[PDB]
């Protein structure tokens, strides 16, 4: 408490460059995020894609998170036990790209983006642990 502490906790170990907690029910909004980065700018439309009925179209040509182009690697967001989607950003002209995990709780999405060279498994693991915690708390 409040939600900013969650961002402090997620960013503490230095492996992530961005982190967010986003309420996805009703009118979606960012509850907390790293200032001045990417997830802070996620839109209701982008949230709807993440959580929506269509689990196929985001393979034709990816999705965006705060305007940032990403490709979907694994989609288990709506699957019991997993509740996660892994992505990798797409860049123009070999600018670095980064792994992202989104996990889904009863009321939130937890989003994490790794720093350059950080493996998707570290990111996934962190994001999943925080989602598990939040679900145990009825969130």
């Amino acid at each position: 408490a409040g939600w900013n502490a969650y961002i402090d906790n997620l960013m503490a170990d230095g492996t992530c460059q961005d982190a967010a907690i986003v309420g996805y029910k009703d009118s979606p909004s960012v509850w907390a995020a790293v200032p001045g980065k990417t997830f802070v700018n996620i839109t209701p439309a982008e949230v709807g894609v993440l959580v929506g009925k269509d689990r196929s179209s985001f393979y034709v040509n990816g999705l965006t998170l705060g305007g940032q182009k990403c490709s979907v690697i694994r989609d288990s967001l709506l699957q019991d036990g997993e509740f996660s989607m892994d992505l990798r950003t797409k860049s123009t002209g070999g600018a670095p790209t980064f792994n992202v995990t989104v996990t889904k709780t009863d009321k939130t999405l937890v989003l994490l983006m790794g720093k350059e060279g950080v493996h998707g498994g570290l990111i996934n693991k962190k994001c999943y642990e925080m989602a598990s915690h939040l679900r145990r708390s009825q969130y």
């Binding site: 408490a1 309420g23 909004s29 642990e129 925080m130 939040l134 708390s137 969130y139």
Partner: peptide, 13 residues
């Protein structure tokens, strides 16, 4: 309207 209160954080290891 704004976000609900945040639950307590995980146990610090």
């Amino acid at each position: 309207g704004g976000p609900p209160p945040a639950p307590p954080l995980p146990a610090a290891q």
